[PDB]
Design an enzyme around this catalytic site. Sequence first.
Site, short mmCIF file in Angstrom:
data_model
loop_
_atom_site.label_atom_id
_atom_site.label_comp_id
_atom_site.label_asym_id
_atom_site.label_seq_id
_atom_site.Cartn_x
_atom_site.Cartn_y
_atom_site.Cartn_z
N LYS A 143 0.81 -1.21 0.00
CA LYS A 143 0.00 0.00 0.00
C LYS A 143 0.85 1.26 0.00
O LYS A 143 0.39 2.31 -0.48
CB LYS A 143 -0.97 -0.01 1.19
CG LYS A 143 -1.79 -1.28 1.25
CD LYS A 143 -2.48 -1.53 -0.08
CE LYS A 143 -3.66 -0.60 -0.30
NZ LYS A 143 -4.38 -0.97 -1.55
C1 LIG Z 1 -7.34 -2.26 2.77
C2 LIG Z 1 -6.09 -1.89 2.98
N1 LIG Z 1 -5.00 -2.78 2.62
C3 LIG Z 1 -5.15 -3.69 1.50
C4 LIG Z 1 -4.42 -5.00 1.80
C5 LIG Z 1 -4.49 -6.04 0.93
C6 LIG Z 1 -5.31 -5.90 -0.35
O1 LIG Z 1 -4.76 -4.90 -1.15
P1 LIG Z 1 -5.78 -3.99 -2.08
O2 LIG Z 1 -4.98 -2.96 -2.85
O3 LIG Z 1 -6.79 -3.29 -1.20
O4 LIG Z 1 -6.50 -4.89 -3.06
C7 LIG Z 1 -3.83 -7.22 1.21
N2 LIG Z 1 -3.10 -7.34 2.34
C8 LIG Z 1 -3.03 -6.30 3.21
C9 LIG Z 1 -2.21 -6.44 4.49
C10 LIG Z 1 -3.69 -5.12 2.94
O5 LIG Z 1 -3.61 -4.05 3.83
C11 LIG Z 1 -5.79 -0.53 3.59
O6 LIG Z 1 -4.60 -0.18 3.79
O7 LIG Z 1 -6.73 0.25 3.91
#
Ligand SMILES: C=C(NCc1c(COP(=O)(O)O)cnc(C)c1O)C(=O)O
Lengths: 468, 468
Positions: B51
Amino acid sequence: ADGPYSGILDSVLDAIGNTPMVRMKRLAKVYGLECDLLAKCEFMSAGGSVKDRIGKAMVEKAEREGRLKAGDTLIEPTSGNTGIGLALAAAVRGYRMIVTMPAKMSAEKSNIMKCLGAEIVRTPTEAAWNDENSHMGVAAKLQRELENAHILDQYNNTANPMVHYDVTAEEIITQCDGDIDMVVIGAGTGGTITGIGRKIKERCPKCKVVGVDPKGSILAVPDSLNDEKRLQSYEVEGIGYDFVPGVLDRKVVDEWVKVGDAESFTTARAIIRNEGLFVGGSSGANVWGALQAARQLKKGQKCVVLLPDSSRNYMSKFISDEWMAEHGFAPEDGAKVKEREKQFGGARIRDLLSETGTSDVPFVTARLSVEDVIKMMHETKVKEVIVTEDLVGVLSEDHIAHSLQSGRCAMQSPVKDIAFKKLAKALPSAYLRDVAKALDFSPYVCVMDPHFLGVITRIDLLHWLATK
Amino acid sequence: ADGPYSGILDSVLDAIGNTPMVRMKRLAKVYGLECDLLAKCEFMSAGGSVKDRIGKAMVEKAEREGRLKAGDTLIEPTSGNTGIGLALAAAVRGYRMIVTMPAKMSAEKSNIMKCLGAEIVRTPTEAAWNDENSHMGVAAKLQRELENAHILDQYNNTANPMVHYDVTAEEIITQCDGDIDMVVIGAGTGGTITGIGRKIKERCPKCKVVGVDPKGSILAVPDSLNDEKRLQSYEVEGIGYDFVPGVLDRKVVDEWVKVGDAESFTTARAIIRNEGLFVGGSSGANVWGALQAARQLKKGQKCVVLLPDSSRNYMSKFISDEWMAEHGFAPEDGAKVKEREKQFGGARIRDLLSETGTSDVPFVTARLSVEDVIKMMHETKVKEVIVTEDLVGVLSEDHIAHSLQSGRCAMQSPVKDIAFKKLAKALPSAYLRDVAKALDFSPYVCVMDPHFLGVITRIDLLHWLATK
Ligand SMILES: C=C(NCc1c(COP(=O)(O)O)cnc(C)c1O)C(=O)O
Ligand SMILES: C=C(NCc1c(COP(=O)(O)O)cnc(C)c1O)C(=O)O
């Protein structure tokens, strides 16, 4: 561009090193430092520390000399990071790991080496190096008592400083374009400072190399600098020992700077806050030594500081404000705790409940049908309600309606199922700083005497601060 | 070679991305998988998660459109990692950070965002997206209540999937040489899967893209897959929501795999144990989905799995065997807990004290002069002694002599000063597995009823195991 990671890697051992160098402009501007303070962010290796390198390195030597076969056992005394590096190498290449580490070290290092399939024998903190209850003496005893075991002995193996002389120092040289004026680097086993300083002084002789030694250790020169707290135990992990390790060439270092616990931890938190480098405490020690040693430098000159360790190893220890308050350490110049102390001061929730204006928060026995509770909520004109047993939590009409629409809340179902179950208890004598720290972990904050007066959220405190 | 980090970096924002790809050969051989399971180790970014990218990305958009000036406030609903990325960007470029995160998320994310100077408002776990007590509704309320504040809204901002389409997907393509057969990637906001899958299917149309959704979420297609535990709260953090985010293009994903808590956590621990990648739980979910989806693949084909998160954010949560036992999750196929359960079984320390062979461990009141205690030790012929007050610790003759030589132990000084102060209490009814777990954190283990029978160390347990 992309040269080193542009392909696929065979194992995690190939992701060790190749660490970037970041200019800490904000931190220099904070401390009033004219020169460029460059940071080698060794905590960004695959294992999150500089020691990964030597870990890998030593195994390679032990394999290039044929001294190591599959199934063998590796024993190593460590403060935690070399144990992690050797555990990585063992899990990849199929060796058995036994770590000997003092009780002073963090529990995160222990847990992470446990996840890597390593046995962990801990030794007393106060033991000297000569004791057979020392980490090194216990490792020697295990080598004597175990078959096919090997001690790579990072304190005496030439791989330890040779690889910091071969790749890491060459890394620092190639990214600083040869122009290095000062290098500040922590002295643990001394392998990193020996290797890096030797290679740099060979390629740039005008460079000063500053060694950092914690108050308590005996590695600094001369001994008139070590007598602050002679052999007094300290909290920083990674640097300083009760003897000069075999790989430490104290003649290749020019200066010595003594740094204590308080300065190291407050400067590590300053690094995290002002640069955003999730860094360890020993790196706070190194950066404090660098800020003291490179004060006489000018703009344009580059002072390179090593950041050995990642915050991951001290996540519960010093990242937590609770523990730094329990050890009586100044948090930081600009920190959230001091900010809350400034804005709130001694104001207690009594003052907020008085200034806002009758504790008439409705209560229900937490097993009412949702129909009865919505009828009571509509007859009382309140929006939120508190459920408790013979405390359960809070419950709002918004969640009622939306979860009835969602297919999660039945009509005859008990209100316990849909209430908010994460809560924080407080009492009117509590200060506002403590309720803010509690709001860092819990959405609501409710009071009691069992007579609760209301619910407190972050927007309520924001409104109170708006009245000031 | 060295292209991207071969210079000096201006800030930590420039150390985001450029993550290596590692082949998980050992894990594939463990699970019986023929193809190459490639792992994009997004947890190795400067902020330790994928992220970071979008965090940086969004600010860049907000700066390239002039929408953001110094001193502004940034508000963002997040499960924790986007809050960290935006907090990094704010600490570097001088913005104020406010994070809205549910109570379900770990405390390490909260503490790390607190070290980055960010305000933290937590929301209830069970709240729906429509509730104004939701993280998104609370962030909207704060935007309404605060001046110069901005919500970048990673759920609807095109930067979120556009940057995974621009750089990260291009990264995966350039390191796999265009040949990609399957991509398994977690579905949180869905930005990463949307962007990466779109770019890959554009450059390699024969590639299947598999989305991973936790049991409880409603993102998988069709809804006949989501009804296992409909809207039942889960422990994994990062993937799945109670609505389809704006950036999620579920039509660009071919398959959906449902993965629960137990499988995700045991496979994350398997990744750490077998590959040595200090990885997060959502990455366990993604890898379990990949092992189930890519089972039909052949050797030579490459299945790319995203490892979003670093272990740093769940260091106290699931790295700790205590918490995984409290949540009733199978530890791992090969783990230290199961190893100790196999070797020790139900043997208690009574059995070891009986098989070895009179509880005659000398005791002293912990304020004796060292001369009296050494005379007693020489008259009793024992080597170690136990000091206690009106328990203090253990004390050996080796440390006595060496610390007298060292200048730390006076003749008339009390034996409390030189005794070993880190201890672990046990009692004969305790099993051997529990004393081994205790020995992971403490050097000695002593028994009591206050009548102590002896001291227990790791070499004693090794000897007992040698008798079996
Ligand atoms: C939803 C959020 N993170 C996405 C995330 C994901 C999924 O990534 P996405 O870009 O939301 O599809 C997988 N693993 C972890 C630890 C994550 O934090 C956030 O930071 O608000
Ligand atoms: C002594 C050990 N580490 C050295 C170290 C150092 C010093 O690095 P040396 O190579 O020992 O000089 C600094 N910071 C941390 C966190 C360290 O762990 C060890 O892993 O046994």
